[PDB]
């Protein structure tokens, strides 16, 4: 009956990471940035709009009900705990404007989430697309543009889900600009490319990690100022091991065990500077986790939102942009010159804010 906000934070992040694994499997050798927490948060909003079997499919996948006493407040709390000027987010559901909505739903949604279900006239397609893109752009400090692309919606669209995040955290200890140098990055297909790489000598939190098959990985922690967020960087020791070996067994809990086993070793780290932007179409990932009804006409149950007309999700999309740089203000080597996993984590709650694979910086 009573659960500390860490409970939902782990379920949310666990589910978010499972969605990431589906995305990572679908884009084997491409860059991906993604927010496990972001997709959990927006799917929690979608739980409230849905009914019956559509709702159950989402609850079975996420492992909790947004209706339950304690949940809505805990998420609200979590959001406050997590979130500035280096991080900005927005969650939004847009539904066709003249559709009769269930009595009391909009105030009820607002009470549980402190944001509104947006109403728009999709039959004026470009106006509708502009309004949605303007909402997203203005609630990510102008960093996420054109989230909803030309052709993504049309005259017959009735419901659209949107999630967007921008991250540009500044590391606690900066990389000296003068040590930034061009160096060969080895891509998964055997080819190389010369890219700007940062270098820093320091005592880094570090652990080795060995999978059940015997291959091992270097895992470094790079704290951010604020002493609460950290980026974890992970790559196989051997050049020939694919990064998917790691991503196919990733969990929120595994990452906590990594942190648990770390000690501060003195190392020269060489890490590529990168700036990645990705739009994930969430449909196939979520379908693969059992949430199939919501995307299907005359199957989806959105009777909590409207019990007047049928409804289904036309688009569920996340767009994230992450930037990693020297972070400046006013000895054995670890070289990340091969594809690597990164994880941005909030260490008190264990929340996974961001996850990605850098296949080519």
């Amino acid at each position: 009956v009573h659960h500390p906000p860490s409970y939902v934070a782990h379920l949310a992040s666990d589910f978010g990471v499972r969605v990431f694994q589906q995305v990572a499997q679908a884009s084997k050798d491409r860059n991906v940035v993604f927010s496990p927490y972001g997709v959990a948060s927006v799917l929690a909003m979608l739980q409230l709009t849905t009914g019956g079997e559509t709702q159950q499919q989402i609850q079975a996948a996420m492992g909790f009900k947004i209706d339950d006493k304690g949940m809505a407040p805990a998420l609200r709390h979590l959001y406050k705990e997590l979130m500035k000027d280096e991080i900005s987010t927005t969650d939004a559901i847009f539904v066709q404007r003249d559709l009769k909505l269930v009595q009391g739903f909009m105030p009820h949604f607002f009470r549980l989430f402190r944001s509104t279900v947006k109403q728009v006239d999709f039959s004026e397609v470009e106006r509708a697309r502009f309004i949605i893109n303007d909402w997203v752009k203005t609630h990510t400090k102008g960093m996420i543009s054109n989230l909803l692309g030309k052709g993504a919606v049309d005259q017959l669209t009735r419901l659209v889900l949107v999630n967007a995040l921008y991250f540009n955290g500044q590391f606690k200890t900066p990389f000296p600009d003068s040590s930034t140098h061009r160096r060969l990055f080895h891509k998964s297909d055997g080819s190389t490319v010369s890219v700007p790489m940062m270098a820093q000598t320091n005592k880094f939190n570090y652990t080795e990690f060995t999978t059940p098959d015997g291959h091992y990985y270097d895992i470094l922690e790079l704290p951010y100022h604020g002493d609460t967020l950290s980026m974890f960087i992970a790559a196989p020791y051997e050049k020939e091991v694919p990064l998917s070996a790691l991503t196919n067994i990733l969990s929120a809990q595994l990452i906590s065990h990594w942190k648990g086993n770390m000690t501060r070793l003195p190392r020269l780290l060489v890490l590529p500077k990168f700036s990645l932007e990705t739009e994930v179409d969430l449909r196939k990932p979520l379908e693969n986790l059992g949430m199939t009804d919501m995307f299907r006409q005359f199957q989806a149950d959105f009777t909590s939102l409207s019990d007047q007309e049928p409804l289904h999700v036309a688009q569920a999309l996340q767009k994230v942009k992450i930037e990693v740089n020297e972070s400046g203000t006013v000895p054995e080597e670890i070289i990340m010159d091969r594809p690597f996993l990164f994880v941005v984590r909030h260490n008190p709650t264990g929340t996974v804010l961001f996850m990605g694979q850098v296949m080519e910086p």
Partner: nanobody, 119 residues
Framework: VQLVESGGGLVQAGGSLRLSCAAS????????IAWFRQAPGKEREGVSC????????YYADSVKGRFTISSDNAKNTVYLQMNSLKPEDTAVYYC??????????????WGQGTQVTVS
């Protein structure tokens, strides 16, 4: 409680077909009513819906303008008028009824399905 489709068959592209579904053991109009179809190599998909909330008709994007769904209360019969048929409309068409204000899973009753082949 029975749902029996009929009116299926063979027609060339551009022609018309009228499917029917006759219910016994219940009254259609009380229910939300849908037609679905499963074409070769594809999953079963919604085609059309009459929502019991207010009797309004809705259609899948690919059939809107060509297909009409209707209900004859006196006959306890539901129809799907299919006009301007394309080869992509070839499928086994199912009628379903559900005790709800709008068409949505799970459905209470399905018919056996009737073959429509558009050459």
């Amino acid at each position: 409680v029975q749902l029996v489709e009929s009116g299926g068959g063979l027609v060339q592209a551009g022609g018309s077909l009228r499917l029917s579904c006759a219910a016994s053991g219940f009254t259609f109009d009380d229910y939300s009513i849908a037609w679905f179809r499963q074409a070769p190599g594809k999953e079963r998909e919604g085609v059309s819906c009459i929502s019991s909330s207010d009797g309004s008709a809705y259609y899948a994007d690919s059939v809107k303008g060509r297909f009409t769904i209707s209900s004859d209360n006196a006959k306890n019969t539901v129809y799907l008028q299919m006009n301007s048929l394309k080869p992509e409309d070839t499928a086994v068409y199912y009628c379903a009824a559900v005790w709800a204000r709008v068409c949505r899973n799970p459905y209470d009753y399905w018919g056996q399905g009737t073959q429509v082949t558009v050459s």
